[PDB]
Design a protein around this nucleic acid. Structure first.
Ligand code: NVP
Lengths: 405, 530
DNA sequence: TACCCCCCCTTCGGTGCTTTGCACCGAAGGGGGGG
């Protein structure tokens, strides 16, 4: 049968415009959509349809063919009542200590189950044309979409039915599902992990889930903030370090800076060296000790939403902080590429959101340090994931950027 | 005639029309009644609500339009002529009474009800309706899909009623093929003039003269008035913006600078000599016509960028040198502080977006910048940006950063301690500073905000310093502004600060927290606050 | 006593830290091409 789907009480539909595409990512969309329609996946819709959502063509990891990707953020915001309240699932906390998790794609599995007739008038999209030469070919899904938050909810029953045998045979692994993605976590060696992965692939193929790459949550190390070390300190260095222990006072209650100011009482030139007094040295040692200890008074709250800031530290280095309440962080990272500039930001965004899914389970709302037009023009060219977070652009960060040196 | 009808419904929660009857005089009644009865007799047409009568010697509706199912627009964008490929033969066929041929839906036939002050219900799609263009275009493309499926080599564009068909077949062969196009359109009950009434090049479409081998903007006329009002200036600037797409080198910033501070549209404002020179040069470049060229798939797009000054950029997208395809200008002022590299970045991204929507592929830039300058800008900047693929053209003026801040302090240079404390209420501030060598200064200020004094304390320090200087500031606002490395600003104070910073051979800045008693910054508090 | 469309320009509001001022982006007005 078909599970009935409805939006919130008196909730409107997706009205979003499709911004232009390269001619290659339009030829590919035309070919893919003709192939999909010639065997019943999609059906052309008439002018009476008042709702539209964007569409893109990407290339998956280590592949050559193109893959359609339909943005569904607005529809997900409409539908959140149908998934969060109805089928709020629990998140397996044992997935954050797994030795190595593998990610597989199960979006193709959704290409058989039909969709509600009433709801089917919301998943409408259009492939655009070059130069507005012609009106765009429009379409809508018959089968369930891949990218909608309710589609996993609809397919969850069959997913549990298929996964009961494999889970019963071996309970060591942990199974998680987010959108088209399945995360499998095993405490097994990589050599036998590959054999287990291919066995799961065959098991999926037998029951009708055709599927054609590894994270290490044990190797994910948080990055504490650390002060520099030098034998001789000048006035400029003392001034730099003092204010950093003043901004950090808000983050950590145990950072005290009153004796590090004892070295700065009069107007002195920046270059001149200053010796370190005993009380100031004790204060510096105590502050370093507090900085070594982790953040205090923070705890994950699933009711609220996650926020992820990214800052550019130069020479292919980025920092990112995931939290929920200002000056109460839940994580801290450091991405590095040891290429392009937008490419690194795209890859960092993907890594941060994948980690957020693995630990917490909900992707954060990014605060990107990029031009909005530049992002919207370039983000598709380097995006290999099959899902899109929500992002807002931040005009200016505190200037010190104390997170790295 | 046998065209499938798209169903249409009204907006949920309400009903159809409720407009009252509109009786009028009997002079204009019959002149419309006879033709209405004729078009009823032809068979295209055959419930308390009714539609008021409109007489022209024409049916109008607003309540219906506002109480109708919302549609999704079919042609939101207009094809820029630059992207059209060079078709050897072009023909235009204007379909007549197109909205008469398109039928209506059974549900909405009841809702459509016109009653003269005799009542009829529209069995065909009416005109002047919100849903008319989408429905009509969908029906038209449904009709034309079989022909294009059967014949791939021709190209067809449908704009409202007119259809433009291009072909690479010979003139006799093109006429032959257009004959079957005419027959196919006639079969579906749509009229089309014969070969006697067909149009000839140049085709005047949406303000464009179109030829088989070149395109041009329709003759643009500029006003010639001894004095100009607000509306005349606005019309001027609009026409200049419209005409910039093919005529290189047009600036309209000066003219636009007059529209500020006034709101009345009937006022008269004398010009300025800068605006007079603008007009003179615009007329000089607009004196003789120029023409574009049609795109070729086998050639490589190139889009040069050049600077004019004060924030104007021009570009000339072309494929073969000295054979343009498009030109344009960028003059938007994004942000209260910016330099030339940021504006070059914005211009490049705007060009890429336009070339993607028009041509589908990104061109190969030729920017007026050096590789080292770009590199040193991007790596040291807080945000992220990428210019696709560019080569270097040595056409002055070039783009470069004027003053480079130093990462490390400077030996042998003075060290100023600046701040500023201005009362929010009395609007009296005090900008002062001290130096490690003992120099002290304090200046009263009238009618300034709590940030103005702190901002121009750095100006005081720079003015009273030498070539090498270190400055200590206790406000993040001024630090961020100066570190952004601006070249221009809304306020002239920042311009003064930039002018001072350009002179210095080596300048270094440093932030220090305030209101804590840190270093010598606590000393200047006694000089500026009390 | 209409709309709707794309573009370019100035002007007001609301919200965010860049704080009770300044900055920013989206919305409105006005022109251009119209159908
Ligand atoms: C108005 C218009 C819009 C879009 N395309 C065209 C036209 N009209 C032309 O006259 C035309 C001229 C040159 C090349 N293509 C043209 N054609 C195309 C169909 C061959």
């Amino acid at each position: 049968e078909t599970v009935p789907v409805k939006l919130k009480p008196g909730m409107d539909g997706p009205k979003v415009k499709q911004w232009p595409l390269t001619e290659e990512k339009i030829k590919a969309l035309v070919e893919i959509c003709t192939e999909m329609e010639k065997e019943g996946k999609i059906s052309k819709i008439g002018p009476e349809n008042p709702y539209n959502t964007p569409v893109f063509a990407i290339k998956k990891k280590d592949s050559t063919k193109w893959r359609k990707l339909v943005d569904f953020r607005e529809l997900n915001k409409r539908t959140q009542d149908f998934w969060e309240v109805q089928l709020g699932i629990p998140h397996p906390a044992g997935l954050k200590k797994k030795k190595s998790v593998t990610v597989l794609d199960v979006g193709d599995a959704y290409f058989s189950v039909p969709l509600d007739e009433d709801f089917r008038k919301y998943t409408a999209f259009t492939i655009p044309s070059i130069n507005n030469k012609t009106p765009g070919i429009r379409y809508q899904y018959n089968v369930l979409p891949q990218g909608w938050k309710g589609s996993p909810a609809i397919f969850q029953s069959s997913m549990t039915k298929i996964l009961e045998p494999f889970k019963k045979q071996n309970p060591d692994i942990v199974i998680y599902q987010y959108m088209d993605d399945l995360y499998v976590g095993s405490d097994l060696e990589i050599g036998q992990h590959r054999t287990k992965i291919e066995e799961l692939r065959q098991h999926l193929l037998r029951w009708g889930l055709t599927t054609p790459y590894e994270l290490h949550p044990d190797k994910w190390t948080v990055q504490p903030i650390v002060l520099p070390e030098k034998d001789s300190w000048t006035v400029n260095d003392i001034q730099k370090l003092v204010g950093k222990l003043n901004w950090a006072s808000q983050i950590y209650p145990g950072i005290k800076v009153r004796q590090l100011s004892k070295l700065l009482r009069g107007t002195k030139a920046l270059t001149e060296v200053i010796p370190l007094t005993e009380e100031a040295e004790l204060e510096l040692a105590e502050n370093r000790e507090i900085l070594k200890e982790p953040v205090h008074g923070v705890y994950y709250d699933p009711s609220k939403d996650l926020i992820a800031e990214i800052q550019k530290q130069g020479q292919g280095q980025w920092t990112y902080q995931i939290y929920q309440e200002p000056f109460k962080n839940l994580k801290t990272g450091k991405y590095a590429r040891m290429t392009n500039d937008v490419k690194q930001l795209t890859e960092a965004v993907q890594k941060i959101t994948t980690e957020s899914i693995v630990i917490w389970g909900k992707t954060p709302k990014f605060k990107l340090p990029i031009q909005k037009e530049t992002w919207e023009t370039w983000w598709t060219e380097y995006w290999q994931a099959t899902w899109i977070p929500e992002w807002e652009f931040v005009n200016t960060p505190p200037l010190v950027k104390l997170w790295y040196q | 005639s046998p065209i499938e009808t798209v169903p249409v419904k009204l907006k949920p929660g309400m009903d159809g029309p409720k407009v009252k009857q509109w009786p009028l005089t009997e002079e204009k009644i019959k002149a419309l009644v006879e033709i209405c009865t004729e078009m009823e007799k032809e068979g295209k047409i055959s419930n308390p609500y009714n539609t008021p009568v409109f007489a022209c010697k024409l049916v109008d509706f607003r309540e219906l339009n506002k109480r109708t199912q919302d549609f999704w627009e079919v042609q939101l964008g207009i094809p820029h002529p630059a992207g059209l490929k060079k078709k050897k033969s072009v023909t235009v066929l204007d379909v007549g009474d197109a909205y008469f041929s398109v039928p209506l839906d059974e549900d909405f036939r009841k809702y459509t009800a016109f009653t003269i002050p005799i009542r009829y219900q529209y069995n065909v799609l009416p005109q002047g309706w919100k849903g008319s263009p989408a429905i009509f275009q969908s029906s038209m493309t449904k009709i034309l899909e079989p022909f294009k499926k059967q014949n791939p080599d021709i190209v067809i564009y449908q704009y409202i009623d007119d259809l433009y068909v291009g072909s690479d077949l010979e003139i006799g062969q093109h006429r032959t093929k257009i004959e079957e196009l005419r027959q196919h359109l006639l079969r579906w009950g749509l009229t089309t003039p014969d070969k006697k009434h067909q149009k000839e090049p140049p085709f005047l479409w949406m303000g464009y003269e179109l030829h088989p081998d070149k395109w041009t903007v329709q003759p643009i006329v500029l006003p010639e008035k001894d004095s100009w009002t607000v509306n005349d200036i606005q019309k001027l600037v609009g026409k200049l913006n419209w005409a910039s797409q093919i005529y290189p080198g047009i600036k309209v910033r000066q003219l636009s600078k007059l529209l500020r501070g006034t709101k009345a549209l009937t006022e008269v404002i004398p010009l300025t000599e800068e605006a007079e020179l603008e007009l003179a040069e615009n007329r000089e470049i607009l004196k003789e016509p120029v023409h574009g060229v049609y795109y070729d798939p086998s050639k490589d797009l190139i889009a040069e960028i050049q600077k004019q000054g004060q924030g104007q950029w021009t570009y000339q997208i072309y494929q073969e040198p000295f054979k343009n395809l498009k030109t344009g200008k960028y003059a938007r002022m994004r942000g209260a502080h910016t330099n030339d590299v940021k504006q070059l970045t914005e211009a490049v991204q705007k060009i890429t977006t336009e070339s993607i929507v028009i041509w589908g592929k990104t061109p190969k830039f030729k920017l007026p910048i050096q590789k080292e300058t770009w590199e040193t800008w991007w790596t040291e900047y807080w945000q992220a940006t990428w210019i696709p693929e560019w080569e270097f053209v040595n056409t002055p003026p070039l783009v470069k950063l004027w003053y480079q801040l130093e990462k490390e302090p400077i030996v042998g240079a003075e060290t100023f301690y600046v701040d500023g404390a201005a009362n929010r209420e009395t609007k009296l501030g005090k900008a002062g500073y001290v130096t490690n060598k003992g120099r002290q200064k304090v200046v009263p200020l009238t009618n300034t905000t709590n940030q103005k004094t702190e901002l121009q304390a750095i100006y005081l320090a720079l003015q009273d310093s030498g070539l090498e200087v270190n400055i200590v500031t206790n406000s993040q606002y001024a630090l961020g502004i100066i570190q952004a490395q601006p070249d221009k600003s809304e306020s002239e104070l920042v311009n003064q600060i930039i002018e001072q910073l350009i002179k210095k051979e080596k300048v270094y800045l440093a932030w220090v927290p305030a209101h804590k008693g840190i270093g010598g910054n606590e000393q200047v508090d006694k000089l500026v606050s009390a």
